[model samples]
Target: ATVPLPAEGEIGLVHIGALTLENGTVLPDVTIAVQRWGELAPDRGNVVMVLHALTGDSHVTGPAGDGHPTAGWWDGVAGPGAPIDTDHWCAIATNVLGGCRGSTGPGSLAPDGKPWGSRFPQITIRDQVAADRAALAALGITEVAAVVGGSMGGARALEWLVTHPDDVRAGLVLAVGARATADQIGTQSTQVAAIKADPDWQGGDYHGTGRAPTEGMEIARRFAHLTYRGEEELDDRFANTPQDDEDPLTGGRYAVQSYLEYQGGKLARRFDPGTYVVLSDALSSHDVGRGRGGVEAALRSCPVPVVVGGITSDRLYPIRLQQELAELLPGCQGLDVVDSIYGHDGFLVETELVGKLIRRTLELAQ
Candidate 1:
């Protein structure tokens, strides 16, 4: 039942052995990259599980270096003196299973020492959560004070709460829903298509072949980023203004177009197109009630206390999703919503509000 614990306060690739997928597929080798900040109690208590969104990695907070692709996505929310303070609670984050950032993914070498790429197995939200649990177990964390997540991270949090209810004391699900709405599935599916359409994709097995589907991944990121922010925010931020010294009516593009282009390029530099396809497909298939009767039935039965948070300006996930979570969860603590212009990404931007709700939920462990 015990796995090797990584060095405290550093990112380590912890081996959790093989994993059996929900679809009965077996990934022969699985290693989770994890980072923990805080003093671990002698008994391995006071653990706080921090899950990452779709594009996020194990770097929850800190500078970009070594294994970290981008700087911590939710830095201020959980830090030395932040809400999920590392002084008392052992805050931890792990790269999900279908990720390119240190975890087992398409970009990683297979058992034969070749990149998995197209050969990487299909994974579900529950499958991702299962990997997280095994990673925690490897760290010797049998239970956690709270599990906090936003966006795709929230989906994993919900799955963790439902399947392993007793392992978690409290959970904070932000900017997510019980399942994928049609809008979500359609948008996520489109992004996957965009990645696969690239001529360089080579059926998504392009790794180590001296080529990559950067163009397709860039387009996919552009589409996904639009969903991450609010419509009103985009309008107010960009409007019809042309990019720099160029004419949109002729051969140039608008400011928004340039912005999206920048975002796409950024992702293309750090992410693998194959990983993008795998995770996006997983997000579309995220249904908490897939086999547990129904969504309402599943939520109404979860005994773990949960706090649901939402962004008022979110058009993709919308506020209704969190509202539904609050209404259905039997142990619902509060339906906290933050008024923001950042849309679904509000949870990451509004650090104070997110940290507050997270702190409150963490208290449930006491």
Candidate 2:
């Protein structure tokens, strides 16, 4: 059975048909869930694509009530009067291809009606962009005024600029690099291993099983959360501090451990372990130069204008990575640094600054 689209609002589904991966694996009947705001211009020149991060969905800017599981991740930057300004632009957000939230992912059913799970083929950043391109075409959007994203979303934005340069006028890539770094791959591998180690994982075919790998996924989330924030912030906030009314010597937990547990539990409640593993693997495999010569050569070939930036305190992707990308991109107009205490997550925390940069980038595109 096909996944149903949202009843109200602009949330809809677009069937992109079957897809063939770089590894020659074929996935049948892929569908993308998209959410839109405002009206598309007659020329389709005002369309702006907003990509979501790993755990983010199509709900880009709206209340948490009703169909949305959570408030828009970039709510402050993508509303009627926000920097994105729906009144002046038709903003569209897609649930990435391998996303668990209303997209064709590991949680989706295969031709035999069973969940893909372990059978889900490996996907790359370029593959995700290709799926989105089909989704956009199905929606009658021929061209995008700008593509904006941060973190994993940022990688997709860069891929869009390179893979479909003629279709994208400009791109705003924040808090990401041209490819996944060695450190990033190492960390992601550990997270994947953590999930597989769970007894309930069952080689990724635990869909119908009563017991899911929630504990392992939770642990993985905890590990990722540490990388998302700044070391100074964490150390200053909970350095050797014990949880309120609890002593570590008495088998109690530290405040930092409690915070991590809360974050992990929060994600485990709404996310699937199988989908997490699939997306993490995709991230680890991200390499803009995989087949297009090298990183510099690939970026130099792109005709679309690009604005690359990164969080100053981001250790995961790091500012140097964005700097390298900026230096290599032929159309890059220098790097914009987002100074924040939130590290990689600063892209979300420093919305005002990020929004200003996006607004400037859109102007540059014009």
Candidate 3:
């Protein structure tokens, strides 16, 4: 009914206590939900911290059941004989702090027993990473062998390399940039606006209101899904075709429209709008060079070895971002570009490429 890791099939929670955010907001009660795999080396030095992207939870590998509504997102990479090879590397993934999936966030109960809602402080990528560090410490893991992530996860992994170089030996960052680009902030801001404009949002305290901002979330996802894939991919796959027997002129949708609707509805079912807004804003706050001169200086000063990766067809976080990182980070393993038609989602869809990056990151630790 279970398995082992390179910790085994262990899913649970850890209390991270109070967190003092980068902006000085403090949450007196904080907890992080975590899932771990593989055997812990006697020295616990084989620990690999696997980070998840936006809207992702700690369930990195396994079936859907119990508290999990979906199967593991990276099942192809983290299992036995997989690229990362749980048979040798201890893999641990967390529901990012400020996320809704069993982690403290806008949807979690505050100290007063009410959902944090409007009171949930605006947090940053640094704050989220701080929470993760504390969570690992609570589990008696003071040092990490390598950190691996993609998209939003990759942003935090970059932060880890810059801020905690001594603690994390190496890193693998895929489909991410050092800071939020103007285009990313614009679209993400629009998504947040979509949810906030919803009458059901209730100013971020929608819990117990008997209704949620599902419609607004669906719309937001529709827009985001477009960015998550390449334009060429869409043109090739859908190509203006009418959906099935439906007539677009008669008010029916094109094939692409139907696909977007399905993606939107799917996220609406499992994601909380409030969490979406909070994390989106958090991503917008991603800047590894905030106080370290600037991005170039920060990357140049980083001591930890890192592997930077990107999808060749990614429109959201383009390969140019990874190229820049590879040029800046003195210890970088060079830019690894994965060729795929899946766009920004190539990190998840092209597991073999991502796994190769993971393996390369581990090699840096050696």
Candidate 4:
């Protein structure tokens, strides 16, 4: 059932419409509110599409959820008068299909009067881009100023250019690559396996069971969070902190590990374990040229200007890979390397630089 967009001060939910997959299966499709700031000037060419990371919602700017601080994840640089200004552009974002927010996912009810749960069809980066195209069409957005994303979001941005070259005027792929490397696939799969292995997972039918694989999800997060931060960061922050003293519950473990465990607990609260598995596996198989020829051929075929961003310290999508992406594509310039100590997660932490590059790229598109 489609919910109404909030009127006046209330938040509204916008249904993008049901998605019909290639296999002829119909999945419910929905996006969050499309908040506009400036006057609607159709001729101004002020449409920007921002793709969210895994577990991210479409509430990019404005107030946070009922109890949180500031706004949503990228709230720092997405509001009025900020770079990629909502005041200047009709900024849009969507909860990806198989996502927790407004989109259909494992938690959503299936057509047969049961939760999809383990039955949700698998999705890929290309599948996500196809759904995004539907959302953009629903908004009457004919062309986009640019498609920008980070991490898995970044992969989707790249897929946008790959699958629909004519629709996107520019693309910003930050903290990701043209494809998931072997090691990236391995690590993500390991995490997925860990989650599924939990006895409480209930064999992918956890709905109505009243018990979730919380332990599995937490451990998965702990392992992935370790990759997000580098060894140097760990050493600098909590090399000698006692874990037992840090935690009254477990005595001071290393402060860093304790902090990661805390993050894991939060993940279990807001995110669905099945959705995580779905998206993670989808991301693992994220190759820009799956059905196309291959990576290099696909890059050579894209015609729009592409701005590939990477962190100097990112171990996941290392700086060298960004360099390789730039080199392969004709319209691509050199890599936009941002210096940060946050490693692979720099795309989320370095919003200032991201906003600046976004603005510059949009201006160039003009």
Candidate 5:
């Protein structure tokens, strides 16, 4: 495969309230971006949609601004000669309805001219997927060769196969369970609570009125970051690593904490606290069995081929769960099992492996 080049463009953050739930709350208008390669086949069956993980946007495998390669969840996997090769396929990546980036989210204004904030209705995995489906349909993409995603994105991918089985020819589910486990829910819940506890939070209505919860968001990132890597990895690097006595600027002990503090502060600047709460809650509520009768029935009922994968070092979603998913699905071909100390987040950090697996999934395309 040849080295991939950069592709960049933006779409209007249009108001499409199709993602609104039954609770009378209106979802914000979603924004979608398409970076395509290869010629339009005229068949409409050659298009591919690539979904991003939590906190990840549509810059999956290309350059962001400043001419530096964007730290995409999937580094080089979706570029020229890569798995979801832009050279060979039409790839679409969109910000989910309730995302912090250009997409509609809790920070988005309601018809009342205020941020949805706490009033933002809870969204399900299917709801997020529906937004993608609507955007694709609006773009005249009626059929897709495959839907590929990992982590929260994987949940949407699985939903696409079940909710609109005929629309997608193949599914690539990576680094997540068939359903959100209690542990997953608990982990995310703590993050939400921490953010809410921050005095600066001032409820969800922080938009232009009060200070944003920078400290709380940092805490949340710290909590989530633990699951992003393996215990062994942390132990090997920081085990008894004494605090650095020289801060270089401040001259402090153990500057690693400062590094983490800087990272947290950076995230707070780029991401909206409200969007974090909304999307995190949605991820916690992900359940394949939801509203579709049950999990077993849902998996058994899907018509498309399923490609499930796991990361050997992932503590968040263990390989054993994927083993069960493969067993439950009728058309299961476990093409890839990743190995990385990054744990569940490895699916993004380990892109070369992911690319190979995605290429294997593309072979299923009719």
Candidate 6:
């Protein structure tokens, strides 16, 4: 398998060797793409790991140029004097195991020199954390001061505290729960179905066919974007309004529809449908308690300090999810409500508030 390395001063790739899944399947020669800031201490003790959301990559805090597909996702909160503070702590962000942005995923080449496509094995959140552990080991980091993430990334961060407690001292889990809720699974399953329903998907073998299921993927993204934003915000912004020149009464589109279309098109241009399905499936399989007795039991075993937060207007995971997570974890200090009109995406939008919580969480290490 050939994996391309990032250019200098950009994201870098590290081979984490082969990873064996919980279901007894082995993915050969896996690689993780990472972006680093600041310098590692001699004791490798000042390290902080920042995990990304569902559509995010390792470009956590940087400009959009060269190897980066987009600008840093946590731009304001992860720079020199920002919350994560690259000047004071060495920060690392890795593309998740089943990711498309330079990580080992369906888009990557198999041992036979072909894209894994639908042949990619199902991976769990634990598998992703295990892959990250290998990447950290390769980077000579034996311990992390804190693990911070939101949404799907939050799930990974929480898993790290439970699965590899010795490697992490604290965590900031935002906008997520201990396990995938039925509603969450329902939404994700629909997204997966949308991609598979497209004729161009061709059973996930569209790589060499020159005809990808971009339309299906776009539809999936549109569906997801709705869940990411608050209904009140959407109503206030669009409110049954039609596109400026379009006639909704005459088979034309609404303003909200156009917005969703644009978002869907943007993602389809930069992301792969195969990997979308792969990661979405992995998220659906995200039950930290799968084999660890139960959700409460698993969270009770976590030995690290955790700061959990919830988005007040979020309908996807909702505040109750985070509340449950906080109630279950012995080290958690209860859920910090992030009051925002942006709903589930508030974690990305309200950088200042999110940064404040992150700083408070990091203080746990001090």
The Cα local distance difference test for each model comes to: 0.88, 0.87, 0.87, 0.76, 0.75, 0.88
What tens-digit string does per-residue lDDT give for candidate 5 at 1-366? 311212343333433445666345556555443344445466667877788877887666555564223455566676678777766687777778678666777887777888878777888887887777676666666689999998888888888888888888888889888788888899899999999999888878888786888789899987887777777877777664546655545556444466567668778767888888888898898888876788888888887888888888888778887887777778786536787777887888777787777887788875
* Candidate 2 stretches greater than 4 Å from native: 1-10
List of clashing residue pairs for candidate 1: none
lDDT score of model 6? Answer: 0.88
What would the per-residue lDDT of candidate 4 be over residues 1-366, giving only the tens digit for each residue?
323223322334456767766445666644434343334345636777778887676666667556333366676556667877666666677777777766777877777868788888877888788787776666556677788899889999888877788877888888888899997898899989999999988877797789888899899888888777766877888786766546545655777777888989888888889888989988897898776798998989998898888888887777877897888877787888798888888888888988887887677566
TM-score of 5: 0.90
Candidate 1 per-residue lDDT, tens place, 110-226, comes to 999988887888899999998998888777777887889999999999999999898888999999999999999999998888888888899888998888889988988888888
Q: Which stretches of candidate 6 lie over 4 Å from their true place?
A: 1-9
In candidate 5, the residue pairs with backbone N, CA or C atoms under 3 Å apart (3 or more residues apart, or in different chains) clash, namely 243-254, 244-254
Tell me the number of clashing residue pairs for each predicted model: 0, 0, 12, 10, 2, 0
What's the residue-level lDDT of 365 in candidate 5?
74
Error of 3 at 28 (Å): 1.5
The Cα error of candidate 1 at residue 91, in Å, is: 0.6
Which tens-of-lDDT digit does each residue in 108-192 have in candidate 6? 9998999998888998888988898888888777789999999989999989988888878889999998889999999999999
Residue pairs in candidate 6 whose N, alpha carbon or C atoms collide under 3 angstroms: none
Error of 1 at 146 (Å): 1.1
RMSD value for candidate 2: 2.3
Q: Which stretches of candidate 1 lie over 4 Å from their true place?
A: 1-9
CA lDDT for candidate 4: 0.76
